[PDB]
Amino acid sequence: MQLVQSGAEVKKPGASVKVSCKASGYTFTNYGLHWVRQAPGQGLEWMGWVSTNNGHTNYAQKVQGRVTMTTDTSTSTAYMELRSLRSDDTAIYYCARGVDLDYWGQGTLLTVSSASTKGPSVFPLAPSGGTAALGCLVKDYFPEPVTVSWNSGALTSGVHTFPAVLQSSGLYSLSSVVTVPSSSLGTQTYICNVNHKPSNTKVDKRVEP
Amino acid sequence: SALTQPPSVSGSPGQSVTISCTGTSSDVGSYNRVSWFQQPPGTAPKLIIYEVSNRPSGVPDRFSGSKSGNTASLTISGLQAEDEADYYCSLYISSSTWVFGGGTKLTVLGQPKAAPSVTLFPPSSEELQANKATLVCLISDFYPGAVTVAWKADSSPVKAGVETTTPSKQSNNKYAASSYLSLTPEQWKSHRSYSCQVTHEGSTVEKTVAP
């Protein structure tokens, strides 16, 4: 019924990471678990299997020697530790249930980079059919993602937050635009709320004519 | 990926398409626990076939699976637009070991052509005050999902400072993309205008902004 994975991790080369996968809504010890990763734009790659009732493990030749898979039956949680991290370990890591891999967690992003996390700079995109487009430019953050809301979630109609661009700086930018009535400009207040969890930052920006 | 899949397959609604997963007599030819997974963009994989031919409850009947020789095959009999996804096979090869195929991207054709909508923003006062300048070109609601973007300073091609996304599918099954142009405040003030020119299926449309 549920596999819920831990939050995204940002690590330097040579460091270690340990991610987790909490099971619920089924009998934990009745099914083994797998770890499967997926590098950006690439295919699924099986990392290993860990039993929840007999102590056995088996790992992909590729990560043998620097992976450890364990379980904690007190909380129905599986753990995967990966050591001596390299840049191309950067991937989304999934846990999956059982011998056919019938249910998957939502994934944990691991970014391995010499660059540090960086929160965004936010700029207003002022408004110029009876409607106007206004928005927020979310510049130069790392890694993904950012989320954007408008007026703390009170404004939802007509919002389009676009996929990010990865720039030649190695940082990301995106924009969020909302289409509103032109008559509203200067009597309604518009504020974008930008969240960048990797840097533990939140930014509010008022967008005025 | 010790199992080989075609990088891409395509067809039109109602057609049948088969995606192959090819190994050797030592793996696919010797073992029977073949799974297939359907993965929407930005989503976890979903199991849609297990043990070569069985469908998990709820998976549409048009998905079926077979195996012959050293190839396992996923067949979609009567394609629908909602079937667009990446598909993966996997195989259990004893000794607690699983192996995946490389993945296949499935395209379902037949959506009508839709020209892009373009919104272009100039640099903000605030960014200029920070001695930076970004032009923002937002491109939406187009199909098929490919565009090229060129920028002009007055009428001359812009050769530096451009960043453009790959198109991605929107929730309405049309596509979106963004292009950004980085300038100095001095470059932005010094020209009469800048334009974002978007080319879609041979047709070029545009927006222009001026300081």
Numbering used by the authors:
A (entry chain H): 1 to 128, 134 to 214
B (entry chain L): 6 to 216
Q: Which sentences did the original study use to describe this structure?
A:
In this work, we have studied the binding and determined the structures of two antigen-specific Fabs derived from human monoclonal antibodies raised against NHBA, one of the components of the meningococcal B vaccine Bexsero. NHBA is a lipoprotein that is specific to Neisseria species, and its gene is ubiquitous in all meningococcal group B strains. As part of the analyses of these Bexsero-specific antibodies and in an attempt to increase the structural characterization of NHBA, we selected two mAbs (named 12E1 and 10C3) which, according to preliminary epitope-mapping studies, bind to the NHBA N-terminal region between residues 1 and 300. In this work, we describe the preparation of the complexes between NHBA and Fabs 12E1 and 10C3, the characterization of their high-affinity interactions and the determination of the crystal structures of apo Fab 12E1 and Fab 10C3 at 2.7 and 1.5 Å resolution, respectively.
Among the 15 apo 10C3 structures determined in this study, the highest resolution data set (1.5 Å) was selected for full refinement and validation and for PDB deposition. These crystals belonged to space group P212121, with a calculated Matthews coefficient of 2.33 Å3 Da−1 (solvent content 47.3%) and one 10C3 molecule occupying the asymmetric unit. Excellent electron densities throughout most of the Fab chains allowed model building of residues Met2–Pro215 of the H chain and Ser2–Pro212 of the L chain, except for H-chain residues belonging to loop Ser130–Ser134 and to the terminal TEV cleavage site of the H chain (Lys216–Gln228). Disappointingly, none of the electron-density maps calculated from these data sets revealed the presence of bound NHBA or fragments thereof. Instead, for crystals obtained by the in situ proteolysis experiments, the slow growth of these crystals (∼60 d) suggests that extensive proteolysis might have taken place, resulting in the dissociation of NHBA and thus the crystallization of apo Fab 10C3 only. In summary, the structures of apo Fab 10C3 are highly isomorphous, although they were obtained from crystals obtained under different crystallization conditions, which include pH values ranging from 4.2 to 6.5. The binding affinities were also measured for NHBA sequence variants p3 (long variant) and p20 (short variant), showing that Fabs 12E1 and 10C3 recognize all variants tested with high binding affinity, except for NHBAp20, for which no binding by Fab 10C3 was detected. Moreover, the lack of recognition of 10C3 by NHBAp20 might be owing to unfavourable electrostatic interactions, as the slight sequence differences between NHBAp2 (243-KSEFEKLSDADKISNYKKDG-262) and NHBAp20 (180-KSEFENLNESERIEKYKKDG-199) in the putative epitope region might result in a different electrostatic potential distribution on the antigen surface.
